Amino acid sequence: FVDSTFYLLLDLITFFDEYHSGHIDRAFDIIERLKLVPLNQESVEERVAAFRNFSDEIRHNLSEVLLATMNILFTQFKRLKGIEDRDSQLRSQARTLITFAGMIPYRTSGDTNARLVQME
């Protein structure tokens, strides 16, 4: 258990290194790997069920996990210029993430200013 949290913290850190310094695409891939945040469907709630269970160390970290996601998600999905462009994904991801954030704002520091980054 102790080691597991350890690796998670390291993974999150590598995500940080690559978050900024560009590499928007890479950040999503890694964050998803964490298996902390709902990329799939409305499984956002399962992410609720598995949230309280979370160890104290991680439970604290989630705030940044979200908003990192809505950032890369934003910047990467800068509306492009002028073909296959599936904007839909990396869009659904924000949606699931927001539902997630919506469900646990009380158990979070109190910055659903995801909204600012969310829109434009």
């Binding site: 999503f28 469907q41 499984s43 599936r86 904007d87 994904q89 659904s92």
Partner: protein, 144 residues
Amino acid sequence: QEALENAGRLIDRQLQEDRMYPDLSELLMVSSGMDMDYPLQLLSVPNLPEISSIRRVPLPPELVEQFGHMQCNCMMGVFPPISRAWLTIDSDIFMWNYEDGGDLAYFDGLSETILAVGLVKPKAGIFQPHVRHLLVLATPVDIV
């Protein structure tokens, strides 16, 4: 007598037993009638249920958007090795990451309608033997 040799012998014997396990299908098994544990209801077999549905992923709207206009022909499928899904509308083809969904690739190469697509292994000895997989695409006129 030595425990170490003893233990090794036990595991080996068991391993042998595991390997010997009966063949999956035999006519004799259900010659009269099949034993079935069959419920119509989901999760009807509470403890036993062989499969569960972990998740549902919708086709990304970004992908769908470039499928909006299709006069002639539609088709889609999953490539087993790739862990990617493909959609064909008319001439164009999309491949999208199963795990991601945001990540999608598009073929602009094809001029004409795409009759069929398939994933195949490369030949033993050609210039591209190295590549893991080949994508065959057939249109009315050509196979690429």
